[PDB]
Structures are given as structure tokens and as C-alpha cells.
Design a protein around this motif. Structure first.
Motif, short mmCIF file in Angstrom:
data_model
loop_
_atom_site.label_atom_id
_atom_site.label_comp_id
_atom_site.label_asym_id
_atom_site.label_seq_id
_atom_site.Cartn_x
_atom_site.Cartn_y
_atom_site.Cartn_z
N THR A 85 2.94 8.19 0.83
CA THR A 85 3.63 7.78 2.26
C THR A 85 3.29 5.98 2.42
O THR A 85 2.29 5.27 1.71
CB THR A 85 3.33 8.63 3.45
N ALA A 86 4.26 5.37 3.02
CA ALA A 86 3.84 4.10 3.71
C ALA A 86 3.97 4.05 5.28
O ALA A 86 4.74 4.62 5.69
CB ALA A 86 4.45 2.98 3.16
N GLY A 87 3.00 3.41 5.67
CA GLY A 87 3.27 2.95 7.35
C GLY A 87 4.48 2.09 7.59
O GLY A 87 4.59 1.45 6.76
N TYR B 258 -1.89 11.72 4.03
CA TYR B 258 -1.26 11.43 5.26
C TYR B 258 -1.51 9.96 5.90
O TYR B 258 -2.76 9.43 5.66
CB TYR B 258 -1.93 12.59 6.20
N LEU B 259 -0.63 9.58 6.86
CA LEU B 259 -0.95 8.30 7.64
C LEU B 259 -2.24 8.68 8.62
O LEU B 259 -2.85 7.76 9.12
CB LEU B 259 0.38 8.15 8.48
N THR B 260 -2.06 9.76 9.07
CA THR B 260 -3.14 10.40 9.99
C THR B 260 -4.14 11.66 9.55
O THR B 260 -3.42 12.48 8.90
CB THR B 260 -2.50 10.86 11.53
N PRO B 261 -5.32 11.78 9.74
CA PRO B 261 -5.78 13.00 9.36
C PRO B 261 -5.64 14.25 9.84
O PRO B 261 -5.26 14.27 11.07
CB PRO B 261 -7.44 12.68 9.73
N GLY B 262 -5.10 15.26 9.12
CA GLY B 262 -4.79 16.64 9.43
C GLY B 262 -3.47 17.14 9.39
O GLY B 262 -2.90 18.09 9.67
N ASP B 263 -2.60 15.98 8.66
CA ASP B 263 -1.10 16.40 8.37
C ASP B 263 -1.30 17.56 6.98
O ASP B 263 -2.27 18.04 6.48
CB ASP B 263 -0.21 15.38 8.18
N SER B 264 -0.19 17.89 6.29
CA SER B 264 -0.16 18.77 5.21
C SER B 264 1.03 18.43 4.24
O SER B 264 1.22 19.20 3.46
CB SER B 264 0.00 20.37 5.77
N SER B 265 1.76 17.49 4.28
CA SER B 265 3.03 17.01 3.53
C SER B 265 2.42 16.58 2.28
O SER B 265 1.52 15.82 2.20
CB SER B 265 3.69 15.93 4.12
N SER B 266 3.16 16.60 1.34
CA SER B 266 2.88 16.26 -0.27
C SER B 266 3.30 14.98 -0.57
O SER B 266 4.28 14.33 -0.10
CB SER B 266 3.35 17.30 -1.23
N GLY B 267 2.47 14.21 -1.65
CA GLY B 267 2.70 12.78 -2.00
C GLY B 267 2.74 11.65 -1.50
O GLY B 267 2.12 11.86 -0.20
N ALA C 124 0.74 -1.17 0.23
CA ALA C 124 0.02 -0.09 -0.06
C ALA C 124 0.92 1.16 0.03
O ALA C 124 1.64 1.32 0.85
CB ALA C 124 -1.03 0.08 1.26
N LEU C 125 0.82 2.07 -0.89
CA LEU C 125 1.03 3.59 -0.81
C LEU C 125 0.01 4.33 -0.61
O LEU C 125 -1.04 4.55 -1.48
CB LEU C 125 1.53 3.85 -2.26
N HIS C 126 -0.11 5.30 0.50
CA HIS C 126 -1.11 6.40 0.52
C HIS C 126 -0.91 7.49 -0.16
O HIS C 126 0.16 8.05 0.17
CB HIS C 126 -1.20 6.56 2.29
#
Lengths: 49, 49
Positions: free
Chosen positions: B46-48, B35-44, B30-32
């Protein structure tokens, strides 16, 4: 209307087959049996296993 | 980190009559998109962990 059924005996597993026989399941008497391809002869009894 | 010390027997899951010659494999991750958590602001992507 025409339908031609045709069948392949190729190297992958056999996978389409005609409907297999089944009978009532008698107990406490000596019988021959087949269970899903397991053949034998014996008295069949309700297990504690 | 690491595998736990101990004995564990894996049970049968499924058996597929598929006939193909496998020689290679690959894992699907899985690639998100966000954000891993609702309310971050980083682009592109991520993976847990």
C-alpha cells in the motif's frame, strides 16, 4: 615502501586542494582583504546587518 | 488537492561538485508491505495518499 601520488585536472569540478591561508581579523583600519575568494580594500567594521 | 496560491522563495539547500551529465530523473516512493494503520488485515503493498 613506495607511494606514488598522482593528480587529475579533468572536466568535473576541482575538488582536492592544498590548505588555504588565514590571518587575524583587524577592524577600524584601512586594509586589503580576501574573504573566501572575495578580494578588496577597505575599512572593516562590525555590521548592523 | 492542488498547489496553494501565493509567493514563496526557496532557499539554497546544498551544492555538490559531482560532474555527472544528468538527462533523466525518477521519484522514489515509500511502499508499505502492510497496513497504513495498525490492526487492518488486507494483503500486499500500500501507499499513503
Amino acid at each position: 615502501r613506495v607511494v606514488v601520488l598522482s593528480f587529475e585536472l579533468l572536466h568535473a569540478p576541482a575538488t582536492v586542494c592544498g590548505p588555504k591561508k588565514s590571518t587575524n581579523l583587524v577592524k577600524n583600519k584601512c586594509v586589503n582583504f580576501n574573504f573566501n575568494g572575495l578580494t578588496g580594500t577597505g575599512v572593516l567594521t562590525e555590521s548592523n546587518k | 488537492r492542488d498547489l496553494p496560491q501565493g509567493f514563496s522563495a526557496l532557499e539554497p539547500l546544498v551544492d555538490l561538485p559531482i560532474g555527472i551529465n544528468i538527462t533523466r530523473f525518477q521519484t522514489l516512493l515509500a511502499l508499505h508491505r502492510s497496513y497504513l494503520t495498525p490492526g487492518d488485515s488486507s494483503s500486499g503493498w500500500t501507499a499513503g495518499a
